[PDB]
Design a protein around this ligand. Sequence first.
Ligand code: HEM
Ligand code: HEM
Ligand SMILES: CNCCc1cccc(OCc2ccc3ccc(N)nc3c2)c1
Ligand SMILES: CNCCc1cccc(OCc2ccc3ccc(N)nc3c2)c1
Ligand SMILES: C[C@H](O)[C@H](O)[C@H]1CNc2nc(N)[nH]c(=O)c2N1
Ligand SMILES: C[C@H](O)[C@H](O)[C@H]1CNc2nc(N)[nH]c(=O)c2N1
Ligand SMILES: [Zn+2]
Lengths: 411, 407
Amino acid sequence: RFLKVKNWETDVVLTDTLHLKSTLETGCTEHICMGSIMLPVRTKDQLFPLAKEFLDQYYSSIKRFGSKAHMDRLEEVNKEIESTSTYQLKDTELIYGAKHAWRNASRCVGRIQWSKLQVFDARDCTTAHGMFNYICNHVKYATNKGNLRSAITIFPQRTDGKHDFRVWNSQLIRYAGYKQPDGSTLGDPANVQFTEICIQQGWKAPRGRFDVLPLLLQANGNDPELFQIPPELVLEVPIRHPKFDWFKDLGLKWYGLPAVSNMLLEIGGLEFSACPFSGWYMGTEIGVRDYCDNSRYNILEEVAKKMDLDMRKTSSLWKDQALVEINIAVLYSFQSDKVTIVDHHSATESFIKHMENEYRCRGGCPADWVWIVPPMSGSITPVFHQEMLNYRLTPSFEYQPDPWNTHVWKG
Amino acid sequence: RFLKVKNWETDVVLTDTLHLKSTLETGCTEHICMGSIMLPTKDQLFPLAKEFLDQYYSSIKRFGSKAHMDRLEEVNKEIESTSTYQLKDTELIYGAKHAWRNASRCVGRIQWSKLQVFDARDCTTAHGMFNYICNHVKYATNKGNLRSAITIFPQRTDGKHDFRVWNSQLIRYAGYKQPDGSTLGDPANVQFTEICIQQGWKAPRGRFDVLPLLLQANGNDPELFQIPPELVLEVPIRHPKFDWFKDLGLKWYGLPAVSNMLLEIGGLEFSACPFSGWYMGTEIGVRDYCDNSRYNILEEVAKKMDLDMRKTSSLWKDQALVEINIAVLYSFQSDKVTIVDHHSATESFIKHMENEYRCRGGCPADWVWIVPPMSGSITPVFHQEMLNYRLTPSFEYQPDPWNTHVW
Ligand code: HEM
Ligand code: HEM
Ligand SMILES: CNCCc1cccc(OCc2ccc3ccc(N)nc3c2)c1
Ligand SMILES: CNCCc1cccc(OCc2ccc3ccc(N)nc3c2)c1
Ligand SMILES: C[C@H](O)[C@H](O)[C@H]1CNc2nc(N)[nH]c(=O)c2N1
Ligand SMILES: C[C@H](O)[C@H](O)[C@H]1CNc2nc(N)[nH]c(=O)c2N1
Ligand SMILES: [Zn+2]
């Protein structure tokens, strides 16, 4: 079966065959589309075809499908599974898997970069102190003095689900959020619940507006431990505006390195529950979502006031005007400090090129329109007019429940 | 089988049961989502009618009544006899309002029950259609105090006697391909602006020439009519601050009147059902003006603002996009023509969505279309999970008549 997607702006039509290699469920049916729903212990039974499917993929990619190397590897994995109930990936396979999980991430607009991923193998890690060391090294490597480099560090895979490695932080670097008795929030409201746990776990909170949260690290199913990232490793950028001098006095800054640390990496049926990865920011992530979401720092108004906008009627678009100036300031600040960032026009333009290349070289590119379109100025980016097909390929990044909701406490 | 949708800004959770009454197909499967794809007999008819009469009689608290059962037999008898059937006015109005209510892509559905339905099923000719369309336009326009309206022409019989309005909208600006290479007027209508000529129109080859109507009655060849200019309410576009904005020489019409959709009620097909409401500002300023394959004046506005158009990172496009949209809203509000901003309209829609979940058990919604084309995440709908499914009565797309007309 063939599927065609049309760019309504260029009339370019593409043909998808890759969706045939799709296994996992979308959430949708003939009768309902769940395309806007945010988030819609394995027996040897279902493990071998998963491993085999992965190894067939891997060996096809290295032009060795059906080789003796391929066949012996299937045999070895087969024997390891029935003997030990799981298996170990070679380094080559692990790197391939991690890159392809990113390549397959249908909500990621930054996928043009997928083949340049530095993969750090942390599978020999046994303790939280070990995890901290690996993560420090990741951050130092990734940050690279502002010249950001994509990287992923992969901790040991799940076994029985009782000895999981988990990074409890949703991102390696994030600001604390504190709920005040009067109902207001100090810092990042997105992090209030996590900040609380940290505090309960013995973190002494500075209680400022931009306190970098400690790492809360769980090795081998043991209770998580607190670690402070060395501040010299946390690259931060003071936000200023190129025309508005009062903007700096808002006292804003943001960290340079977006490093998502709560997702699960699935490769050949193996589950890596702690696999922090990082790239670099698209400006709107900070300027639109992190500062302007009503459920975040929500500074739209204070910016709007300082611009002396007509804030009486929404039809003055004061919210839209403030939003743009803030995003201008984020991009200005990062570029001025030589910290890698990409604006949404550049990023979506790149993604379109990537996508067309993928259709050609791969037979498709799974893409979630809902996430790919930037949170501002959607229709003046080329992705907006781009029809996209969403389907799930493995290897993949998956969500997993927050660890504090599932963790069995030792003491 | 009972579905929950979360709003991520408010944690408000809604439970949908209404999707269970869905009948048509989405284009999606368990293995692939097509959420971002724009366009995915005597025996067929009676269950379709039954289904409709069932919901109709339920809506008036007379499900399981003599009248219900009697109407059911009558329609059934009329079907087996005539191979189709006629709706009663009450049912027709009900069906039209519910087609709007069920339009998952429409952010303006909070207004769904205030729809003026104009029964034009007695119409036989293009001149007749023209008369009805002029009356619709005058009524809907209301000197700027816009009112929602639909005019419904005779239902399809056998696909040979189709009533069709060939325009995509009752009011749209001409577009001509220059010898220069680019495009004069509206690029979206170049192919239509041509068919008008190829049928006999005489373009003032201008930039904002109101297109003539091309009206097809009873399957016959379509005929050109000029909408009386005095019925076409237009708004000169100025900015409340950029005095140079006027010189760009832009205007737009007040009445968005979509005329190429097919209205399906109780199995019956109304191929000609032009309907109109009023604009959300972003439809004109974001899409009509700033789309690359439309008026595409972003660059020109940016220059007059003397923004740094050297690198995309200055966000000059975004900056200009906003000013343009401020001007549109300002221009309509000034001239006392109904318009709604995307903030108001999405806020209205969340409320409508709440109401529908309460009083109906759900509200089919297409996030891809509901979220406005600018500033999406600072509107409440961006953080709103939505379920998309097809309920009937409904508006459907239909092929362009020229591709299909048996001349
Ligand atoms: C290198 C530059 C990168 C850019 C500019 C970028 C950009 C983005 C953006 C803007 C999103 C949407 C996030 C949101 O709005 O919350 C996203 C999602 C995502 N990205 Fe990328 N990304 C980059 C690198 C990476 C890397 C290195 C990985 C993994 C190795 C990755 C994997 C993902 C995944 C799995 C999602 C979906 C998250 C979810 O489903 O919640 N990205 N990306
Ligand atoms: C009264 C004020 C109204 C507002 C503010 C409004 C708003 C909108 C907007 C912004 C869209 C997306 C259009 C686009 O971006 O191209 C839309 C779509 C739609 N509207 Fe409404 N609308 C209104 C009235 C109506 C009425 C009166 C009807 C029918 C009785 C209707 C039926 C539809 C349908 C069927 C679509 C989907 C069109 C498609 O699938 O291509 N709307 N609406
Ligand atoms: C603001 N939307 C957050 C919703 C959400 C929920 C769970 C995970 C999640 O990850 C977003 C995400 C993931 C990977 C990224 C990689 C690079 C980058 N610049 N942003 C990235 C952003 C995002
Ligand atoms: C710019 N998108 C155009 C795609 C498209 C194709 C076919 C029909 C169509 O209708 C949009 C539409 C329908 C009804 C409307 C009612 C009111 C309003 N302000 N806009 C409305 C807009 C829209
Ligand atoms: C490819 C994509 O489906 C297409 O550009 C859609 C996206 N969302 C839209 N949303 C609205 N409201 N109107 C549109 O015309 C479109 N076009
Ligand atoms: C309900 C909806 O799916 C949710 O708000 C999504 C919308 N699109 C998004 N798109 C991106 N890139 N990031 C997001 O967090 C979201 N949130
Ligand atoms: Zn879907």
